[PDB]
Amino acid sequence: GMPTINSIQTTVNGVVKIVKPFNNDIAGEQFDPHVLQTLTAFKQPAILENDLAALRSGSLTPAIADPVGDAVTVQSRNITALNRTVSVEWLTPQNVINHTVLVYFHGGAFYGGVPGNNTVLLKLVAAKSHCEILNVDYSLAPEAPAPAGILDGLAIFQYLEQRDAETMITVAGDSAGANVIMAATNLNQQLGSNRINQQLLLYPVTAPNADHAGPLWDLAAFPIIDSQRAILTNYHDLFRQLDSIMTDYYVPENFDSHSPLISPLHQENFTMTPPTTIMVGEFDPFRPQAWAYAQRLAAADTATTFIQYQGLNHAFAPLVDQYWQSQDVAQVMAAALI
Amino acid sequence: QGMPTINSIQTTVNGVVKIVKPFNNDIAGEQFDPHVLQTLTAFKQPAILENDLAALRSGSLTPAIADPVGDAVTVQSRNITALNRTVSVEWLTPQNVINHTVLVYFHGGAFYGGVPGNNTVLLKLVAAKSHCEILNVDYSLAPEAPAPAGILDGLAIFQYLEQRDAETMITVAGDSAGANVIMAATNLNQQLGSNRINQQLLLYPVTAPNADHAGPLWDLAAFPIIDSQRAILTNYHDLFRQLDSIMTDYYVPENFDSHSPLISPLHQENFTMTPPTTIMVGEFDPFRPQAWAYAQRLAAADTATTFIQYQGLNHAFAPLVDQYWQSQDVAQVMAAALI
Numbered sequence: 001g002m003p004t005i006n007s008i009q010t011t012v013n014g015v016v017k018i019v020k021p022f023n024n025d026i027a028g029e030q031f032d033p034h035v036l037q038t039l040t041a042f043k044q045p046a047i048l049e050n051d052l053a054a055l056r057s058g059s060l061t062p063a064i065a066d067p068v069g070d071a072v073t074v075q076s077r078n079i080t081a082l083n084r085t086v087s088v089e090w091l092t093p094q095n096v097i098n099h100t101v102l103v104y105f106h107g108g109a110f111y112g113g114v115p116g117n118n119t120v121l122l123k124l125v126a127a128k129s130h131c132e133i134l135n136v137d138y139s140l141a142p143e144a145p146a147p148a149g150i151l152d153g154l155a156i157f158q159y160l161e162q163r164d165a166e167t168m169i170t171v172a173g174d175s176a177g178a179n180v181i182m183a184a185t186n187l188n189q190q191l192g193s194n195r196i197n198q199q200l201l202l203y204p205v206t207a208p209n210a211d212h213a214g215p216l217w218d219l220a221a222f223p224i225i226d227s228q229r230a231i232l233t234n235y236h237d238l239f240r241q242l243d244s245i246m247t248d249y250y251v252p253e254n255f256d257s258h259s260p261l262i263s264p265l266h267q268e269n270f271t272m273t274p275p276t277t278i279m280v281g282e283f284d285p286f287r288p289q290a291w292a293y294a295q296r297l298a299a300a301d302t303a304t305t306f307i308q309y310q311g312l313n314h315a316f317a318p319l320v321d322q323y324w325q326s327q328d329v330a331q332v333m334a335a336a337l338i
Numbered sequence: 339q340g341m342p343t344i345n346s347i348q349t350t351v352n353g354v355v356k357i358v359k360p361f362n363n364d365i366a367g368e369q370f371d372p373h374v375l376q377t378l379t380a381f382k383q384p385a386i387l388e389n390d391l392a393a394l395r396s397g398s399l400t401p402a403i404a405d406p407v408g409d410a411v412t413v414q415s416r417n418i419t420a421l422n423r424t425v426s427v428e429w430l431t432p433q434n435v436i437n438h439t440v441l442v443y444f445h446g447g448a449f450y451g452g453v454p455g456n457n458t459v460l461l462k463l464v465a466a467k468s469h470c471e472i473l474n475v476d477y478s479l480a481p482e483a484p485a486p487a488g489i490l491d492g493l494a495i496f497q498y499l500e501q502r503d504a505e506t507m508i509t510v511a512g513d514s515a516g517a518n519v520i521m522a523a524t525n526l527n528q529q530l531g532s533n534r535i536n537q538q539l540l541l542y543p544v545t546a547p548n549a550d551h552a553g554p555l556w557d558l559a560a561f562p563i564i565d566s567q568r569a570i571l572t573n574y575h576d577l578f579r580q581l582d583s584i585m586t587d588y589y590v591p592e593n594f595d596s597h598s599p600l601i602s603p604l605h606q607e608n609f610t611m612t613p614p615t616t617i618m619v620g621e622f623d624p625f626r627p628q629a630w631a632y633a634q635r636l637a638a639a640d641t642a643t644t645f646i647q648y649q650g651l652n653h654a655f656a657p658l659v660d661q662y663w664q665s666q667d668v669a670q671v672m673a674a675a676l677i
Contacts, residue, residue: 037363040343053410053432053466058339060406062663063373114404116660143409319340 002324014298015291015306020328022311028282030225031232032311034323035283039313042231048241052111052142052249059112065321068123081155081162088156089115089135093126099166100337102126102133103156107175107202107315109246110149111141118174118318121330128334134160138180141249146262153184161195170198170337171274174317175286176246178204182264189272199276200333202317203284206293207265209247209257212240216289224283232283239285239314265293270300277305277336279329281312307332341663353637354645359664361650367621369564370571371650373662374622378652381570385577389584391450391481398451404660407462420494420501427495428454428474432465438506439676441465441472441539442495446514446654448585449480449488449547457513457657460669467673470509473499477519480588485601492523500534509537509676510613513656514625515585517543521603528611538615539672541656542623545604545632548586548596551579555627563622571622574652578624604632609639616644616675618668620651646671 007020022032031039049055073092078085104122106113115135122133136156139148153171160167173181178201185196210216217240224232251257260267267273276297280290287308297304309316309325320326347358361371370378388394412431417424443461445452454474465472475495478487492510499506512520517540524535549555556579563571586596599606606612615636619629626647636643648655648664659665 034342037342038340051434051466051469053407053462056407056410057463057466057669060404060660060666061339062659062666063661065372112406114406114660116404140408315339322340322342 002327013295015294015304018305018307020307020309020325022309022325026311028310029223030311031228031283031313032323032325035311035313035316036228036231039231039235042234042238045234046238046241048238048245050245055109055245056112059108059117060114061117061318064120064318066120066123068120068127072123072126074119074123079156079159081158082151084152084155086152086155087137089119089137091119091122091126091133091135093130093132095130096132097130099164100131100168100170101160102131102170102172102200102337103153103160103181104133104135105138105149105153105173105177105181106135107173107177108140109242110176110180110250111246113177121318121320121326124320124327124330125333125337128331129337131337138177145252146250146255147183149180150183150187150261153181154187157184157188157193157196161193167195169196170200171196172200172202172333173204174202175315176205176208176250178202179206179208179264182206183261185274186261186264186267196274198274198336200336201276201278201290202329203280203286203314204278204290204293205286207263207289208250209243210263210289212243216292217285218288221288222283235283235313236285265289265296267296270297270302273297273300273302275303277307277332279307279309279317279332281314281316281325282308282310283312284314286314352634353640354633354643357644357646359646359648359667361648361664365650367649368562369650370567370622370652371662371664374650374652374655375567375570378570378574381573381577384573387577387580387584394448394584395451398447399453400456400657403459403657405459405462407459407466411462411465413458413462418495418498420497421490423490423494425491425494426476428458428476430458430461430465430472430474432469432471434469435471436469436677438503439468439470439509440499440506441470441509441511441672441676442492442499442520443472443474444477444488444492444512444516444520445474446512446516447479448581449484449515449519449589450585451479452516460657460659460665463659463666463669464672464676467670468676470676477516484589484591485594486522488519489523489526489600492520493526496523496527496532496535500532506534508535509539510535511539511541511672512543513541514654515544515547515589517541518545518547518603521545522600524613525600525603525606525611535613537613537675539675540615540617540629541668542619542625542653543617543629543632544625546602546628547589548582549602549628551582555631556624557627560627561622574622575624578653582624604628604635606635609636609641612636612639612641614642616646616671618646618648618656618671620653620655621647621649622651623653625653
């Protein structure tokens with residue numbers, strides 16, 4: 001039982017923009033009530049400790065209620081290509097359709113997270129689209145910093161393309177995992193592969209460690225009602241802190257975060273970039289850089305859709321038992337695969 | 339991350355700080371957390387316990403639990419030796435460890451079973467957050483090494499730690515039967531004159547093995563639940579009633595007795611030396627009333643006692659950090675108690 005929401009669709013700078021309010025009374029500029037009750041801790045400022053283990057301690061999502069169940073099979077397997085062995089959580093639905101396949105990289109600030117954090121979301125997508133999904137357990141920083149994760153993605157692609165010559169690969173991911181797979185896709189294209197025909201990006205980090213006094217990190221871009229403004233400020237400030245810390249773990253000394261393969265926003269050219277759908281919450285600190293990315297695509301004549309979920313924050317999509325918007329993401333993804 | 343703020347209720351009952359944590363803000367009690375309930379489908383019918391040491395052992399092995407920390411906490415096997423006992427320890431060391439505070443943990447497994455690996459991820463979370471080093475102890479298992487072998491393994495550990503470092507304060511912890519063994523070893527440590535153990539963190543402890551099953555600590559009337567889940571609860575509680583008898587039979591050799599202070603810490607004569615204690619236990623854990631009885635005996639001896647009750651939860655949930663938010667809360671509480 002999902003709500004009937006009146007979404008607003010416009011076209012800004014070539015980008016098809018779809019703004020989805022959390023209900024039909026409030027059009028924007030406040031948190032969804034469901035979201036707000038999770039942000040209580042943000043009434044006081046947070047000081048993020050640069051401690052890798054403590055940080056990872058908060059990257060494990062406890063099991064989400066699974067309405068799909070045995071309708072989709074979830075099994076682990078290793079695949080090997082380019083002398084890399086990558087573990088994937090492989091999802092197979094009933095009546096699987098051919099050629100179309102989805103590759104997903106989980107979020108977790110480059111250094112953390114687990115594939116299990118979005119298993120249920122993907123089960124919904126696989127059950128609805130009848131497509132197989134690779135929920136990839138990609139290399140994590142700082143033990144395997146950039147471009148290890150990128151190369152795992154490239155191995156996955158090479159595997160998929162050699163397995164089947166008619167495969168159409170959709171790449172997806174949330175947050176920092178979306179960043180990693182965007183770069184792997186770029187790399188795959190610079191070697192001459194055209195099998196990736198679509199990107200589904202959930203609140204991606206497109207410019208890690210961007211200027212925090214710059215336009216992509218300006219709180220003036222997030223108007224909100226008075227009673228929720230201290231929370232937003234402290235929330236946004238936590239991610240500001242995370243953005244610095246996570247990029248430090250991800251990028252080794254010999255590399256630079258402002259490079260095209262670390263910051264996809266800074267690619268010199270976006271014309272080979274596949275058709276992309278981006279889904280992000282109104283109050284996600286990574287929203288402006290995601291939008292900037294979208295505009296860069298559209299200017300390169302690549303079809304781009306930007307869905308904004310009003311009242312939502314970061315990392316909401318796997319939480320399909322908490323937000324209708326999460327179920328809507330699952331539907332948008334499935335619809336993009338059929 | 340995205341966890342709706344739970345509104346807990348703190349009261350003081352007979353000196354015990356009681357903190358009740360509902361499984362969500364809608365239901366205050368008297369039913370299973372749905373995440374737990376989905377694991378209890380088989381208890382719609384009476385359970386069949388295979389009374390056989392190999393089956394009992396393998397049934398006390400937890401399948402793999404998702405580990406988000408990885409190498410950020412170092413895990414290695416070490417043997418220590420003291421009192422002419424060699425004890426195997428899974429040693430967890432975080433990067434940048436704080437001095438003088440160390441956690442000794444004993445895994446559950448009904449005295450005859452379990453392995454330290456059952457709760458390794460849980461303890462990585464604790465080490466990660468508290469920067470404390472942790473001894474996850476492979477203590478002697480019944481019946482090959484029944485009471486008081488495990489207790490003495492505990493005593494050997496403490497001496498090792500106290501002779502290693504004169505300033506290092508010890509926090510003892512365990513779950514289920516494992517908590518029982520380390521509670522007794524602590525008691526023993528104190529009767530020999532040591533005061534380096536300054537805290538207990540007990541996860542659903544067995545405080546009175548093989549208590550009267552027709553008595554007040556085993557009365558199903560202490561567990562109000564909605565009609566649709568009464569059968570499941572009854573069969574679940576009943577499984578443990580039977581298990582309580584069996585495990586205690588394995589643990590206690592014929593020359594000893596389960597109702598003794600060192601087998602049943604609830605029946606200690608005196609709790610004045612007992613360290614400040616936090617207890618974490620589910621609403622529907624069959625060992626909840628005996629844990630509460632213990633907490634009250636503590637407070638009556640004027641020992642600081644906190645009793646955290648997780649509504650809707652059953653037994654042995656804490657290691658399962660990829661299954662329940664309560665399991666991670668336990669880690670947070672444990673880590674908070676160590677810093």
